[PDB]
Design an enzyme around this catalytic site. Structure first.
Site, PDB file in Angstrom:
ATOM      1  N   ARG D 148     -23.484 -19.286 -89.058  1.00 29.55           N
ATOM      2  CA  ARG D 148     -23.897 -18.124 -88.578  1.00 29.55           C
ATOM      3  C   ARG D 148     -25.413 -17.656 -88.399  1.00 29.55           C
ATOM      4  O   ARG D 148     -26.229 -18.326 -89.166  1.00 29.55           O
ATOM      5  CB  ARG D 148     -23.386 -17.220 -89.875  1.00 29.55           C
ATOM      6  CG  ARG D 148     -23.570 -15.494 -89.248  1.00 29.55           C
ATOM      7  CD  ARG D 148     -23.230 -14.906 -90.459  1.00 29.55           C
ATOM      8  NE  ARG D 148     -24.491 -14.569 -91.575  1.00 29.55           N
ATOM      9  CZ  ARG D 148     -24.429 -13.710 -92.311  1.00 29.55           C
ATOM     10  NH1 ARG D 148     -23.441 -12.845 -92.433  1.00 29.55           N
ATOM     11  NH2 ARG D 148     -25.350 -13.627 -93.048  1.00 29.55           N
ATOM     12  N   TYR D 160     -29.907  -6.689 -91.138  1.00 27.45           N
ATOM     13  CA  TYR D 160     -29.232  -7.235 -91.842  1.00 27.45           C
ATOM     14  C   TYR D 160     -29.348  -8.995 -91.785  1.00 27.45           C
ATOM     15  O   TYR D 160     -29.382  -9.487 -90.963  1.00 27.45           O
ATOM     16  CB  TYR D 160     -27.618  -7.005 -91.789  1.00 27.45           C
ATOM     17  CG  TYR D 160     -26.650  -7.989 -92.254  1.00 27.45           C
ATOM     18  CD1 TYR D 160     -26.454  -7.954 -93.673  1.00 27.45           C
ATOM     19  CD2 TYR D 160     -26.098  -9.160 -91.754  1.00 27.45           C
ATOM     20  CE1 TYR D 160     -25.678  -8.784 -94.347  1.00 27.45           C
ATOM     21  CE2 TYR D 160     -25.473 -10.119 -92.305  1.00 27.45           C
ATOM     22  CZ  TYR D 160     -25.172  -9.780 -93.732  1.00 27.45           C
ATOM     23  OH  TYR D 160     -24.552 -10.803 -94.316  1.00 27.45           O
ATOM     24  N   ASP D 211     -22.908 -11.782 -87.417  1.00 29.67           N
ATOM     25  CA  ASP D 211     -22.326 -10.675 -87.980  1.00 29.67           C
ATOM     26  C   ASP D 211     -23.110  -9.432 -87.487  1.00 29.67           C
ATOM     27  O   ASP D 211     -24.337  -9.300 -87.714  1.00 29.67           O
ATOM     28  CB  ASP D 211     -22.498 -10.860 -89.409  1.00 29.67           C
ATOM     29  CG  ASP D 211     -21.664  -9.859 -90.548  1.00 29.67           C
ATOM     30  OD1 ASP D 211     -21.570  -8.702 -89.854  1.00 29.67           O
ATOM     31  OD2 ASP D 211     -21.710 -10.136 -91.596  1.00 29.67           O
ATOM     32  N   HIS D 213     -22.420  -6.183 -88.547  1.00 30.45           N
ATOM     33  CA  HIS D 213     -22.386  -5.794 -89.682  1.00 30.45           C
ATOM     34  C   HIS D 213     -22.428  -4.007 -89.648  1.00 30.45           C
ATOM     35  O   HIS D 213     -23.174  -3.416 -90.105  1.00 30.45           O
ATOM     36  CB  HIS D 213     -23.694  -6.105 -90.381  1.00 30.45           C
ATOM     37  CG  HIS D 213     -23.488  -5.948 -92.018  1.00 30.45           C
ATOM     38  ND1 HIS D 213     -23.874  -5.302 -92.843  1.00 30.45           N
ATOM     39  CD2 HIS D 213     -22.913  -7.178 -92.816  1.00 30.45           C
ATOM     40  CE1 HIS D 213     -23.740  -5.656 -94.125  1.00 30.45           C
ATOM     41  NE2 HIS D 213     -23.116  -6.665 -93.971  1.00 30.45           N
ATOM     42  N   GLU D 237     -18.565 -10.762 -85.781  1.00 32.37           N
ATOM     43  CA  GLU D 237     -18.118 -10.069 -86.730  1.00 32.37           C
ATOM     44  C   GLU D 237     -18.137  -8.593 -87.166  1.00 32.37           C
ATOM     45  O   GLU D 237     -19.543  -8.079 -86.534  1.00 32.37           O
ATOM     46  CB  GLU D 237     -18.191 -10.930 -88.211  1.00 32.37           C
ATOM     47  CG  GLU D 237     -18.195 -10.256 -89.437  1.00 32.37           C
ATOM     48  CD  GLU D 237     -18.563 -11.075 -90.523  1.00 32.37           C
ATOM     49  OE1 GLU D 237     -19.071 -12.068 -90.207  1.00 32.37           O
ATOM     50  OE2 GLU D 237     -18.683 -10.326 -91.687  1.00 32.37           O
ATOM     51  N   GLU D 263     -13.988  -7.972 -94.026  1.00 35.01           N
ATOM     52  CA  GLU D 263     -14.384  -8.393 -95.397  1.00 35.01           C
ATOM     53  C   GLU D 263     -14.018  -7.165 -96.422  1.00 35.01           C
ATOM     54  O   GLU D 263     -13.596  -7.448 -97.598  1.00 35.01           O
ATOM     55  CB  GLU D 263     -15.759  -8.904 -95.588  1.00 35.01           C
ATOM     56  CG  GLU D 263     -16.791  -7.772 -95.174  1.00 35.01           C
ATOM     57  CD  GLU D 263     -18.151  -8.402 -94.783  1.00 35.01           C
ATOM     58  OE1 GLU D 263     -18.224  -9.448 -93.917  1.00 35.01           O
ATOM     59  OE2 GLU D 263     -19.296  -8.261 -95.487  1.00 35.01           O
ATOM     60  N   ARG D 284     -11.143 -11.193 -91.761  1.00 33.03           N
ATOM     61  CA  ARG D 284     -11.953 -11.679 -92.859  1.00 33.03           C
ATOM     62  C   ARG D 284     -11.646 -11.086 -94.552  1.00 33.03           C
ATOM     63  O   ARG D 284     -12.243 -11.303 -95.341  1.00 33.03           O
ATOM     64  CB  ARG D 284     -13.357 -10.780 -92.598  1.00 33.03           C
ATOM     65  CG  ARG D 284     -13.898 -11.277 -91.262  1.00 33.03           C
ATOM     66  CD  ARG D 284     -15.045 -12.304 -91.178  1.00 33.03           C
ATOM     67  NE  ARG D 284     -16.255 -12.020 -91.876  1.00 33.03           N
ATOM     68  CZ  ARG D 284     -16.561 -12.892 -93.118  1.00 33.03           C
ATOM     69  NH1 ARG D 284     -16.238 -14.171 -93.243  1.00 33.03           N
ATOM     70  NH2 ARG D 284     -17.793 -12.635 -93.822  1.00 33.03           N
ATOM     71  N   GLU D 340     -16.178 -18.866 -95.021  1.00 36.81           N
ATOM     72  CA  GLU D 340     -17.671 -18.576 -95.343  1.00 36.81           C
ATOM     73  C   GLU D 340     -17.878 -19.218 -96.566  1.00 36.81           C
ATOM     74  O   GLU D 340     -17.079 -19.056 -97.613  1.00 36.81           O
ATOM     75  CB  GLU D 340     -17.692 -17.074 -95.346  1.00 36.81           C
ATOM     76  CG  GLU D 340     -19.223 -16.553 -95.677  1.00 36.81           C
ATOM     77  CD  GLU D 340     -19.687 -15.469 -95.504  1.00 36.81           C
ATOM     78  OE1 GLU D 340     -18.643 -14.412 -95.646  1.00 36.81           O
ATOM     79  OE2 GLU D 340     -20.796 -15.235 -95.128  1.00 36.81           O
ATOM     80  N   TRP D 403     -25.146   0.171 -93.502  1.00 36.89           N
ATOM     81  CA  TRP D 403     -25.799  -0.922 -93.721  1.00 36.89           C
ATOM     82  C   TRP D 403     -24.897  -2.079 -93.498  1.00 36.89           C
ATOM     83  O   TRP D 403     -23.605  -1.865 -93.724  1.00 36.89           O
ATOM     84  CB  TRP D 403     -26.608  -0.926 -95.315  1.00 36.89           C
ATOM     85  CG  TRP D 403     -27.042  -2.309 -95.560  1.00 36.89           C
ATOM     86  CD1 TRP D 403     -28.313  -2.635 -94.941  1.00 36.89           C
ATOM     87  CD2 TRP D 403     -26.356  -3.139 -96.270  1.00 36.89           C
ATOM     88  NE1 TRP D 403     -28.597  -4.022 -95.403  1.00 36.89           N
ATOM     89  CE2 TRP D 403     -27.319  -4.549 -96.039  1.00 36.89           C
ATOM     90  CE3 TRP D 403     -25.085  -3.666 -96.715  1.00 36.89           C
ATOM     91  CZ2 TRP D 403     -27.093  -5.536 -96.642  1.00 36.89           C
ATOM     92  CZ3 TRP D 403     -25.069  -4.909 -97.295  1.00 36.89           C
ATOM     93  CH2 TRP D 403     -25.670  -5.868 -97.148  1.00 36.89           C
TER      94      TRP D 403
HETATM   95 MG   LIG Z   1     -20.149  -9.991 -92.929  1.00 40.94          MG
END
Ligand SMILES: [Mg+2]
Ligand SMILES: O=C(O)[C@@H](O)[C@@H](O)[C@H](O)[C@H](O)CO
Ligand SMILES: O=C(O)[C@@H](O)[C@@H](O)[C@H](O)[C@H](O)CO
Ligand SMILES: [Cl-]
Ligand SMILES: [Cl-]
Ligand SMILES: [Cl-]
Ligand SMILES: [Cl-]
Ligand SMILES: [Mg+2]
Ligand SMILES: [Mg+2]
Ligand SMILES: [Mg+2]
Lengths: 403, 403, 403, 403
Positions: D148, D160, D211, D213, D237, D263, D284, D340, D403
């Site tokens: 990543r 991020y 990502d 995010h 992602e 996630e 995820r 991950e 965030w």
């Molecule tokens: Mg992530």
């Protein structure tokens, strides 16, 4: 219990026409609302004074929602720009009163401050690409974070948004509609060059907008959207007339250029399909033409469910009273996108003394109780109504078209 | 080339308010068009005389479609009850003038006669079932082929359609809107008995209608529709507010009682989903409130692709000018369903002399050139404007609701 | 600027557990918000005092929407019963403080009064039909306009809503979850007789409700809905688990019994499909479990675009702080349907003195500044936390099922 | 019959917070589960120890599914991150026990080995593009097959995934949320340059991830996806917040860059529309935050029907206990995509001694009975809880953002 004892529709033309409702409660608390409908001003005047007003007298001004419903439902024939503009003015005025009683600026009631000020865009224009860009440079020096770009079309005598006026644009300029001629092919061939040059001179941090102004078909907008992607516009506005909301599917299917629409919308129904299908990124509807603070707030919430932000229309034909009201709304929501800001004349500002201020690319409504705006009736009386029409637009063959 | 030399708006109140537009051509050929918007009349008057009328002067009255577009598109803020009613008046009057120039009744220009006359429905109503049925019996004896039935709700002071009037219904009855109290539950529990009894007394040849008048939710309309299936109603009208057109999906999904809606629609866009999804069987939109003969004709052709027929609204707030225009349109289309016919007062008939005639359950526009209708200006002047509002409706708990 | 100087979580059990958040501003203005999550209370207590509360200190209590977003978005892991109940408490307390600062009851800030009071339903239940009906008769004599009916299932030891309580129902009754045994078939075969008899004895003016409490499949709910059509229920609630919102399609497809769902929903996303597809008629989500007044107001506006009304949950595990906030919201919206009202114990009322009042089948929030409710901390301290769980449900074969 | 005699929630901070459930059966067989919910840790602690635990005592640990259902259904309020994280820990622990009794590693029960080890990605970051690439080169030398890439944004103080930490990323770094500032335009303008350079230096065989995010709108992600296609990413992602799953349609319609999300998902319902409409290529969601082995397995199977693979989240805030459990899951399914792998501290590793190993770009769970992980309570007690929050993020205008 705040008895309404008087309601008056005031008409004045400090540089252009404005209509204003003023409502007075039993103990002297007043509220003002904007009711200007450009090019059709006296139709709203009657709807208010001949029809709606008599039902305001004696009512409790606290009852903002009930009053909203009483007039929206009560008219029987529902919605429409005339009706919804009348109602916006009642609603603005009632919120203004509410704020005074509460001793708070209107945004404090609506959810409170959600950002430090309201980011605006200005209005660069020019006959040539060079002209336009020079205007945009000016704006960028004046600290505008977002700028709209309009430019003359090669081989057309005129086109939307270009004139002698630089900090604003006042198209209702005649006692009968000014006639224009149009060519879609000539515009589609040339306007991408503008944003290419804009990026070369202005860089990539500044936000750039463009108003197509109702002149394309969906497969055409789709294509303009595509040609404009390299320049990463903030939005492409009113690309196609939207009575057929399904029209936006074709555009979304073919371009990733962000879309805005809706200054003319009178009610949520004008945008529902567009919002629910995620066909636009910005709604341009305003407290003025879509039924005031009460209604726009419900709409913004629906919009937030579908990644849609507010891009409220901000033309000169929205008085300072509307702008005060728009700012309190803009301040109080999560999904605010942008606020259009055309400068009024210094005579307009004098007639509508207001607490809102401009600095570092942002407007702020100030912190006076209620809206933070009023109308100087004596100064107002110095400038009587003067008939002025929006322009119209025909194709090269004479076909009646959209301005 | 038919130059327009004058265009004046006339307001009179021979029993109720009516607004009329009268256009005069260079050679003394005149035309009239209705512009009445019950309860918001003066707003249309302004929209026309202050804004539209000045553009008419000097134009060629022949260009009906261009003038139509000029006004629809040129207003910028599009559609809505006010704008479209004002445009209706213009459209009707140009068609009237077209008729006269051609020496033919309007219907001859729109397709020719498609039926021997236009079948109407009348209005029987009463406090109790027996009162309503008693009235239905009269209308049948009078040769009506179709009858609308309305009746009081047990446990409610008042309901729609019920009052001291028998040949018509006139709710624009007070200087301030009459307030009413509504209960959906009481209504749904009672109204089906109306039609059970209607069928027992009147039998099964006569068409029986019912106007729900905006008071249900879709799931409630579904249920009322089902409850009424046994009695084979010609239509169930305005069962739910239609701003959300997908609302009819649920009704259509649950009942085979045929559906009507649309008297308040201002443009094609208010009915498009309803028609394209085959959610309705009759469109109630009128030449008066949906932008005239020009617009209603396009709408009717669209409706015919989807099994939808016309059931034009025809309450008394549509003047005989509207009725003349409505009857020419009705005569000229393949997909005619029915025409509402509420008796105007004798004074009204005198103010708007007309050629149309009623015989054997059917209206006919007659055969004079044009629409075959005029306003008697001297007689009109004897009947000043009198402010009068439609009533409003609240629930038992006081919630503002639909009338 | 209203600096937050303190924020404390209070746990008391005057008849049942309640969690309360009390925020204090620099000038001694305080606000309370309910944070009760029946059967998982301490988890919310932790989420607030260990995690959210520290961020409150020093913030401006005026910024309601920003604080709302700060917490919703800032948690990173979004939504869910715990997070949204904790955020509800914060939201309620900030609105309370907003009210006090403005010298107005909360409902005056949210739209003003839309009705004269808030119509409620009560809870009649019993082992046999006659026991349940006997109870319905009492509630009617007590002036309730709406009554929920629950009754024992022949062939099952126990069912929802049935127990030794008459004015309320309190299943969080044991130190370890009470186990129950369920049979869908026996229930479906019996419950319709409940309402047949209800109508015979009580008649057709009173609103009759039923909470299925999660125990059916869509095709089963379809059938129960159909079986109950004759008795015209106001709503049939929680007929199926709603994680799969498309589940309601099949019910809606087969019955016109109106549908309610949503007491357990934590955010707009639990109901979005249900609302947008018009699968339901009432949303049961509350200010307590769906993120407060701020969130529920956005949700209600969305629901109103689709004929959905509010039927907020109001069982006793919602404290009087919730009820105060619920009543202000209820008073302020156009699309109010109904409010559930379960009598709290006398001790509970004493711990949370409040301004709201019950009269003639209706609640009213009253007119004190803020929410009009407080916690008596000394009295609260006399009633320690007592662990208590909701019951669970298994099928005859032992399968874990829904209670 | 494996009686549970004790269940204990352990809290420790060997470099960062972790919560762990430990369950002990009658004859001394123990199982551990992870219950860490970063930034809200003690809310899960209570939900477990104050509420769920008392129902574990005395039950048969063999009954993994029944126990799963008892808690998921039994809580009444359903789902949510707090509830589903609590349940994951019970589930992990129960599977751990199951494996010990069976004398097999947990993957042997779930379908057995489907691949030789679990391919992972690591976490290259840097303030500049050069920085990032140098880090990626390092990883590629260390034998990582997937990497990543995150990099600073020109003109933004922070963004991020960039910090002083290189083998991992620990953003919960403060006792109140660290505040960040954000600009979508500045990121969208610059981040494509990163992957262009990555391909020049690193070549085409290595897998590259990014990502986003949660910081884009759909039409924006669509565009980033498009700009990134030339570099053939393994996935993009969390491009947009996914509560509105329909949001992913726009992206899929416009880019072929592979998509991952999830996630934060707590249950299958958070991904159903995304899976069933084929809007993503990688899920995820993890055993930790979506309800443990039992649930993720059902989800992976549903995912396999729609070409969706697992890309399980693997951040430092998933303890070695979760990672042991994730590996047994990863090993046992056909539609595994990637795992991950952020390195924990050597203190974390000491506290959670584990059998899993890393070599040639792959993790492997080892072949010990059960999960192959435990918790050193004595060492654990050496590191008490320390409050630490995830960061938050506002727009340039102060707007509360993601965030
Ligand atoms: Mg992530
Ligand atoms: O179908 C009908 O006749 C009614 O809807 C009308 O009487 C309507 O109430 C009025 O025309 C409104 O002005
Ligand atoms: O509709 C209702 O009143 C029930 O669903 C509640 O009693 C519910 O059982 C409890 O509030 C759960 O805590
Ligand atoms: Cl209008
Ligand atoms: Cl209008
Ligand atoms: Cl949660
Ligand atoms: Cl949760
Ligand atoms: Mg524009
Ligand atoms: Mg009607
Ligand atoms: Mg319930």
């Amino acid at each position: 219990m705040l008895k309404i004892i008087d309601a008056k529709v005031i008409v004045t033309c400090p540089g252009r026409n404005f209509v204003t409702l003023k409502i007075t409660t039993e103990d002297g608390i007043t509220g003002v609302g904007d009711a200007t409908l450009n090019g059709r001003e006296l139709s709203v005047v009657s709807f208010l004074q001949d029809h709606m007003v008599p039902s305001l007298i004696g009512r409790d001004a606290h009852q903002i929602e009930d009053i909203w419903q009483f007039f929206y439902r009560g008219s029987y024939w529902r919605g429409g720009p005339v009706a919804m503009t009348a109602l916006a003015a009642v609603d603005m005025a009632l919120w203004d009163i509410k704020g005074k009683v509460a001793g708070l600026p209107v945004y404090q009631l609506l959810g409170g401050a959600c950002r430090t000020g309201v980011t605006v865009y200005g209005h660069a224009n020019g006959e040539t690409i060079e002209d336009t860009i020079a205007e945009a440079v000016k704006y960028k020096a004046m600290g505008y974070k977002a700028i709209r770009l309009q430019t003359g079309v090669p081989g057309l005598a005129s086109t939307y948004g270009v004139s002698k006026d630089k900090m604003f644009y006042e198209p209702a300029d005649n006692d009968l509609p000014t006639e224009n001629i149009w060519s879609t092919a000539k515009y589609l061939n040339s306007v991408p060059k503008l944003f290419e040059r804009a990026r070369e001179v202005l860089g990539w941090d500044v936000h750039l907008l463009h108003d197509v102004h109702h002149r394309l078909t969906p497969i055409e907008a789709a294509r303009l959207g595509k040609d404009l992607e390299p320049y990463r516009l903030f939005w492409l506005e009113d690309s196609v007339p939207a009575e057929n909301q399904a029209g936006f599917r074709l555009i979304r299917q073919h371009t990733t250029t962000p879309l805005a629409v809706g200054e003319i919308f009178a009610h949520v129904w004008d945008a529902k399909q567009l919002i629910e299908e995620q066909l636009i990124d910005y709604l341009r509807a305003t407290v003025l033409h879509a039924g005031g603070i009460t209604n726009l707030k419900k709409i913004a919430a629906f919009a937030d469910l579908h990644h849609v932000k507010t891009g409220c229309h901000g033309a000169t034909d929205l008085s300072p009273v509307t702008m005060a009201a728009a700012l309190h709304f803009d301040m109080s929501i999560t999904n605010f996108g942008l606020q259009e800001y055309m400068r009024h004349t210094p005579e307009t500002d004098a007639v509508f003394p207001h607490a809102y201020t401009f600095s570092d690319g942002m407007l702020h409504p100030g912190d006076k109780p209620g809206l933070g705006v009023d109308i100087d009736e004596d100064l107002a009386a110095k400038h009587p109504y003067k008939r002025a029409y929006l322009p119209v637009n025909r194709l090269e063959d004479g076909t009646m078209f959209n301005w």
